[PDB]
CSV table of C-alpha atoms in Angstrom, one decimal:
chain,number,residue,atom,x,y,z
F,1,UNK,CA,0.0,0.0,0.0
F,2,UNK,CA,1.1,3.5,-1.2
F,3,UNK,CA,2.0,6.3,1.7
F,4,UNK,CA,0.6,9.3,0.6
F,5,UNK,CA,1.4,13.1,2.5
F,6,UNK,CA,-2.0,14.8,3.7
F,7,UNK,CA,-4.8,15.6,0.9
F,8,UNK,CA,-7.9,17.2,0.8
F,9,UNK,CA,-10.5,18.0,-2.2
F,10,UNK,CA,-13.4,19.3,-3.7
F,11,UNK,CA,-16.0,17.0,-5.0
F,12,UNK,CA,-19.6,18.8,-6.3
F,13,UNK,CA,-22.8,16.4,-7.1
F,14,UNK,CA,-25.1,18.0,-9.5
F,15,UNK,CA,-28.1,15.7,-10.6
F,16,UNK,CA,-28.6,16.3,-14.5
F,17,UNK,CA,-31.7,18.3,-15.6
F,18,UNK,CA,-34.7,17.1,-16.2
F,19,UNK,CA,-36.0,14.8,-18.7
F,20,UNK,CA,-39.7,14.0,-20.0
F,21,UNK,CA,-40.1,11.6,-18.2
F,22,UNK,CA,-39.1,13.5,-14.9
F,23,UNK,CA,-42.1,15.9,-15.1
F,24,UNK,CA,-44.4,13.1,-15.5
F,25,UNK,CA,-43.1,11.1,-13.1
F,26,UNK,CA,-42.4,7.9,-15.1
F,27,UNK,CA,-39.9,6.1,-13.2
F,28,UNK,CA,-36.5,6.6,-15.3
F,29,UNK,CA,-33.5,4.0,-14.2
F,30,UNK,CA,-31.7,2.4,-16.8
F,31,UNK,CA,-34.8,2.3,-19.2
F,32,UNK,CA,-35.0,4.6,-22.3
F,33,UNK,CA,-31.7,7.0,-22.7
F,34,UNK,CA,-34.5,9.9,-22.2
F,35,UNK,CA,-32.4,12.9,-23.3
F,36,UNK,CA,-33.5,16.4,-21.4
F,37,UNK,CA,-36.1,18.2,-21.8
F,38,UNK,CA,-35.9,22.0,-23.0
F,39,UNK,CA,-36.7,23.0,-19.5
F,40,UNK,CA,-33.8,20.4,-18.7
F,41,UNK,CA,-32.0,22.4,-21.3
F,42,UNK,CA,-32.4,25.7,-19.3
F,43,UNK,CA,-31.7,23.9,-15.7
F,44,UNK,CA,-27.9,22.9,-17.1
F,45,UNK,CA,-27.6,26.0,-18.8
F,46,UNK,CA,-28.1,28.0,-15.6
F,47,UNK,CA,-26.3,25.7,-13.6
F,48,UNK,CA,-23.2,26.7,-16.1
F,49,UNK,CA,-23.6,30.1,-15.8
F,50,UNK,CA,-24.1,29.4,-12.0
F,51,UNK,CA,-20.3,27.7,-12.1
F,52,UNK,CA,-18.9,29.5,-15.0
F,53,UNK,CA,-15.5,30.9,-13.1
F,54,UNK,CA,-15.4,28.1,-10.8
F,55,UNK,CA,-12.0,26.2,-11.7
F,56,UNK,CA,-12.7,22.7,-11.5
F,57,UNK,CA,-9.8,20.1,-12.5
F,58,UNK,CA,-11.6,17.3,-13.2
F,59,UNK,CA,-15.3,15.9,-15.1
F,60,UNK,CA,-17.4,12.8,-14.6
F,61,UNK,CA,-20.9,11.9,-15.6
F,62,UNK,CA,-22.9,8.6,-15.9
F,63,UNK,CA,-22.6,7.6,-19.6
F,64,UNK,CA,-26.7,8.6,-20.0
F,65,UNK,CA,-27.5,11.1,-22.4
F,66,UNK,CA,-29.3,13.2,-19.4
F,67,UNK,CA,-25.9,13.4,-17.5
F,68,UNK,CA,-24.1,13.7,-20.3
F,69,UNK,CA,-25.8,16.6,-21.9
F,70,UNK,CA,-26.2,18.3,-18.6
F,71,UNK,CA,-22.6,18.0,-18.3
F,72,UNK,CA,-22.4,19.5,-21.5
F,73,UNK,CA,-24.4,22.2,-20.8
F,74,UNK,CA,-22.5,23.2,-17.7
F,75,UNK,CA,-19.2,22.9,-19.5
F,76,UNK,CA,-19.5,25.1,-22.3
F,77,UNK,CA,-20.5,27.5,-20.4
F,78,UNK,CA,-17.3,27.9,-18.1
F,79,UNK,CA,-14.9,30.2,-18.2
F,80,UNK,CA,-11.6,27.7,-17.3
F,81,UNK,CA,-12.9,24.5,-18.5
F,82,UNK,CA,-15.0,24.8,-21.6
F,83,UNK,CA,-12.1,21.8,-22.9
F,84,UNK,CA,-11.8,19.8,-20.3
F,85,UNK,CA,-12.3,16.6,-21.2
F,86,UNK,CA,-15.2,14.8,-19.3
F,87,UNK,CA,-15.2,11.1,-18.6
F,88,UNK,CA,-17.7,8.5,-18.7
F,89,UNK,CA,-18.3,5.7,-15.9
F,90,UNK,CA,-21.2,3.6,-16.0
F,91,UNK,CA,-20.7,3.1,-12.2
F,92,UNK,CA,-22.2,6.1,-11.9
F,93,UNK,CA,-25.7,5.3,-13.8
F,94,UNK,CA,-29.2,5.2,-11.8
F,95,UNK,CA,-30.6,2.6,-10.0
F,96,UNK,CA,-31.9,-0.2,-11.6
F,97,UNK,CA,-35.8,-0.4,-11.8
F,98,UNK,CA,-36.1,-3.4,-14.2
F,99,UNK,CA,-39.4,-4.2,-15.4
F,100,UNK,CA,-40.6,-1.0,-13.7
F,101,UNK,CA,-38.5,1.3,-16.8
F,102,UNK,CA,-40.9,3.4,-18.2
F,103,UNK,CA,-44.1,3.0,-15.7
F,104,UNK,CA,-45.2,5.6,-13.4
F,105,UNK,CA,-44.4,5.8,-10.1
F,106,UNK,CA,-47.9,4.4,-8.6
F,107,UNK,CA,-47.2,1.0,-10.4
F,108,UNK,CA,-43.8,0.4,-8.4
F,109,UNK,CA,-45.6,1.7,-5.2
F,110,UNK,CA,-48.6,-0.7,-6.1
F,111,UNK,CA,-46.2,-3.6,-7.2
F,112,UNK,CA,-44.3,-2.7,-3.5
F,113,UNK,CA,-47.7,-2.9,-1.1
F,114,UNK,CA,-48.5,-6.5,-2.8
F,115,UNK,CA,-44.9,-7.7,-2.0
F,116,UNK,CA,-45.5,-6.4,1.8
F,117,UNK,CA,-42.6,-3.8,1.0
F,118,UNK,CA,-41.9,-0.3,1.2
F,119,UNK,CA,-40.3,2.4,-1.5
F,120,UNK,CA,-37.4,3.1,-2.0
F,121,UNK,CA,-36.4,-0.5,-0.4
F,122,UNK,CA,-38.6,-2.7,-2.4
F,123,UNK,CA,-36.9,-3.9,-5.8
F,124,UNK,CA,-38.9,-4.7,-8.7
F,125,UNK,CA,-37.7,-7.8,-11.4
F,126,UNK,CA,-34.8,-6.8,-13.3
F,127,UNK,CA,-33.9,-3.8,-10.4
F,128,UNK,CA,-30.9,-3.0,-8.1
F,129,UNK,CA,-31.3,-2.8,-4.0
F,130,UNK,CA,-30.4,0.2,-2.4
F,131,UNK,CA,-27.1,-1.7,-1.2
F,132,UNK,CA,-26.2,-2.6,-4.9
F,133,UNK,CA,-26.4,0.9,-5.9
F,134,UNK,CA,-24.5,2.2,-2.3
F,135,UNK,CA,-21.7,-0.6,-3.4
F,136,UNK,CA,-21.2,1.4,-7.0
F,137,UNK,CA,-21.0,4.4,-5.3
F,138,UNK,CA,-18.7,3.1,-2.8
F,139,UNK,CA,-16.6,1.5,-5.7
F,140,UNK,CA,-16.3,4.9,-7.8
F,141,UNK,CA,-15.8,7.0,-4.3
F,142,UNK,CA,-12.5,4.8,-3.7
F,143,UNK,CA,-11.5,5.1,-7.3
F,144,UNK,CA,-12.0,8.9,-7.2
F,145,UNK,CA,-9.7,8.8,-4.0
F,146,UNK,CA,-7.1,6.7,-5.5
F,147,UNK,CA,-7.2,9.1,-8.5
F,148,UNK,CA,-6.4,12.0,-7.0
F,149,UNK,CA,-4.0,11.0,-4.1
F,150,UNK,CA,-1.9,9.3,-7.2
F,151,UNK,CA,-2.5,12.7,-9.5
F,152,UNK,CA,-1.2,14.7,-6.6
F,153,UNK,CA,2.3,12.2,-5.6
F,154,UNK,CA,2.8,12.2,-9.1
F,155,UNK,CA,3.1,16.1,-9.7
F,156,UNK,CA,-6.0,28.4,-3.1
F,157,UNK,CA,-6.5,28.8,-5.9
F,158,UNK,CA,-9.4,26.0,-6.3
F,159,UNK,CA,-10.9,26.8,-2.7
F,160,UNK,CA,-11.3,30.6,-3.9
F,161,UNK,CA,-13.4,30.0,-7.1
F,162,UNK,CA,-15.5,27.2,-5.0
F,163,UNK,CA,-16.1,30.0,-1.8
F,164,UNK,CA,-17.3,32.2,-4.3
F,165,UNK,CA,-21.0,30.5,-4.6
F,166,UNK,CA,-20.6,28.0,-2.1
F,167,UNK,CA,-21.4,28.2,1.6
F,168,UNK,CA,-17.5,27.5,2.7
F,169,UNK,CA,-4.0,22.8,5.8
F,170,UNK,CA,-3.6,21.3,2.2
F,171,UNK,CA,-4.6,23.7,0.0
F,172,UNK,CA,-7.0,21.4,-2.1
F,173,UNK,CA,-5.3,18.8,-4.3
F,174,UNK,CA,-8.3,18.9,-7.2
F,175,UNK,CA,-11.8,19.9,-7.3
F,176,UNK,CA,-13.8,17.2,-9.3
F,177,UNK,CA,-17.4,17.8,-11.1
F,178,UNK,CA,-19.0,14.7,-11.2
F,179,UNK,CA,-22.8,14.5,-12.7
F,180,UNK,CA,-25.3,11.9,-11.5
F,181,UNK,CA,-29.0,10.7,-11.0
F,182,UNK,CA,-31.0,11.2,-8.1
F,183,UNK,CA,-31.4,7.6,-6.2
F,184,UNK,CA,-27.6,7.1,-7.1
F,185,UNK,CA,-26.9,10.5,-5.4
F,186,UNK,CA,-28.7,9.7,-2.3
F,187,UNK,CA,-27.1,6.5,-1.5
F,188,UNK,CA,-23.7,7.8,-2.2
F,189,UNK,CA,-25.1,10.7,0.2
F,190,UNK,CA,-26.1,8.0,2.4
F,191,UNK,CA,-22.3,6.5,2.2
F,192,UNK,CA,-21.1,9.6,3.2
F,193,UNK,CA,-23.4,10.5,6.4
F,194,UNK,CA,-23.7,7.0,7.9
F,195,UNK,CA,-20.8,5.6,6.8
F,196,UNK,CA,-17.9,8.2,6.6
F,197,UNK,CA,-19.8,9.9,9.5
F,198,UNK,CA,-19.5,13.5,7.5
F,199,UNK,CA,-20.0,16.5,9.0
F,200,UNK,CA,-23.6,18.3,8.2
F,201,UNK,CA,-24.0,22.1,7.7
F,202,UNK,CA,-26.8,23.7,10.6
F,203,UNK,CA,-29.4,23.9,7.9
F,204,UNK,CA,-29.5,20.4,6.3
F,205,UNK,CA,-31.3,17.7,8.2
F,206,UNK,CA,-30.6,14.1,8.2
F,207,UNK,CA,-33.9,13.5,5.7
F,208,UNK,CA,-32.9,16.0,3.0
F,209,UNK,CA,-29.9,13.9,2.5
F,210,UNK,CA,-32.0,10.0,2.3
F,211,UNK,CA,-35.0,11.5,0.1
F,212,UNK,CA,-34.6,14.4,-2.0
F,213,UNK,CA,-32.4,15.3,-4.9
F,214,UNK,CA,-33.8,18.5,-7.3
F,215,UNK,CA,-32.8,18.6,-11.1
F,216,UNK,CA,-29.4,20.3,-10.7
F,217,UNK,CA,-29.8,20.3,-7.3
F,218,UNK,CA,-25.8,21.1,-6.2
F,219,UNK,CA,-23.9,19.6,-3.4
F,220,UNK,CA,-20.9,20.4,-2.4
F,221,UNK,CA,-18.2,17.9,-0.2
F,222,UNK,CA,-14.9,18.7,1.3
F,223,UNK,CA,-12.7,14.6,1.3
F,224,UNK,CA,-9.9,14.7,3.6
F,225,UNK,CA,-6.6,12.7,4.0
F,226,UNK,CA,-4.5,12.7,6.9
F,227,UNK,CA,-1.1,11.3,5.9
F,228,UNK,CA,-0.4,7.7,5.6
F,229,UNK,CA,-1.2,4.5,4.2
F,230,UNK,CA,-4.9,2.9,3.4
F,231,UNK,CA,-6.1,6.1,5.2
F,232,UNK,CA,-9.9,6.3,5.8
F,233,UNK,CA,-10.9,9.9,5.1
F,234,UNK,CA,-12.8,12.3,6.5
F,235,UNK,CA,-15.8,14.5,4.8
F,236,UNK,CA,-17.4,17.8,5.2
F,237,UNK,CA,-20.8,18.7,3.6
F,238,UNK,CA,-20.9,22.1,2.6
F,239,UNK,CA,-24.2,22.0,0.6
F,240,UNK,CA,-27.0,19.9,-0.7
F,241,UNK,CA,-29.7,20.2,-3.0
F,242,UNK,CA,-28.7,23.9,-3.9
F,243,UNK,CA,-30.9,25.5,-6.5
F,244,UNK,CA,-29.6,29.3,-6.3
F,245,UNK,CA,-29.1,29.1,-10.1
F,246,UNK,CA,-32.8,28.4,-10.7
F,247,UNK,CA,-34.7,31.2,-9.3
């Protein structure tokens, strides 16, 4: 195992805009590839100009055209990173809802009160549990780490650009943009708070984190490595759910 020197960095969470079937409530996992909708369109492009000067260092979306064109949307808009180049990881992608794609919600609620089960636990046929989808974003939160320490042996300004819109020793090694999907989101979310035992802002209760995630809804997360090897590290929540660019 690898001795690394203390780290800390930026990681914002922005759920892509929304799609079709978002405003109709038709349950949206890995069904149909719904693109956004033109009010999806308009979500991503304000949450662009919302983090045009911010200087991120790093891009990564689920390989769905909603993420992707959300990430799109944000990056042409930005001032220092209109180039950068984005990358695609499927462990990133929604939850599974199986034969449930496509329905409305009632009929996974319905299919959940025959099984004597409750949503979000219950999984439909062909759908992931909420510890499958925890374990992907447990899987691509220790990649991420492993990324960034390695980046950073092998080579303010970031904090400043970040303070800026957000509620805020290392100065930060990176600050990664990473764009996701709601369920996904909240179990991650859910890693972070129960798991990591992250600090909470005042203002954000433990429920907005478990059930809750707005189209471009913004959260913002401070990881932090104390020196050493296979160090566990600690995070700060900064924000959740912001919507500031959408009024």
């Amino acid at each position: 195992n690898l001795y690394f020197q203390s780290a800390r960095f930026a990681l914002t969470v922005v759920r892509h805009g929304e799609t079709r079937f978002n405003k109709e409530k038709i349950i949206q996992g890995q069904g149909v590839d719904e693109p956004l909708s033109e009010t999806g369109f308009k979500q991503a492009a304000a949450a662009g100009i919302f983090l045009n000067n911010v200087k991120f260092t790093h891009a990564f979306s689920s390989d769905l055209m909603r993420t992707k064109q959300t990430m799109h949307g944000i990056l042409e808009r930005s001032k220092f990173c209109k180039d950068m180049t984005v990358k695609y990881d499927s462990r990133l992608r929604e939850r599974k809802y199986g034969v449930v794609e496509g329905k409305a919600l009632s009929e996974l609620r319905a299919m959940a009160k025959a099984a004597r089960e409750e949503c979000p636990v219950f999984t439909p046929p062909g759908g992931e549990t909420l510890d499958q989808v925890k374990m992907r974003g447990i899987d691509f939160f220790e990649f991420l780490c492993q990324l960034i320490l390695k980046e950073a042996d092998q080579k303010n300004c970031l904090e400043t650009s970040l303070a800026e819109i957000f509620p805020l020793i290392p100065g930060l090694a990176a600050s990664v943009l990473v764009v996701s999907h709601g369920a996904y989101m909240r179990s991650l979310f859910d890693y972070f708070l129960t798991d990591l035992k992250c600090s909470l802002p005042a203002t954000l209760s433990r429920s907005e984190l478990m059930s809750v995630t707005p189209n471009t809804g913004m959260s913002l997360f401070i990881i932090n490595f104390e020196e050493g090897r296979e160090v566990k590290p600690t995070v700060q929540c900064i924000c959740m759910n912001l919507q500031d660019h959408l009024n």
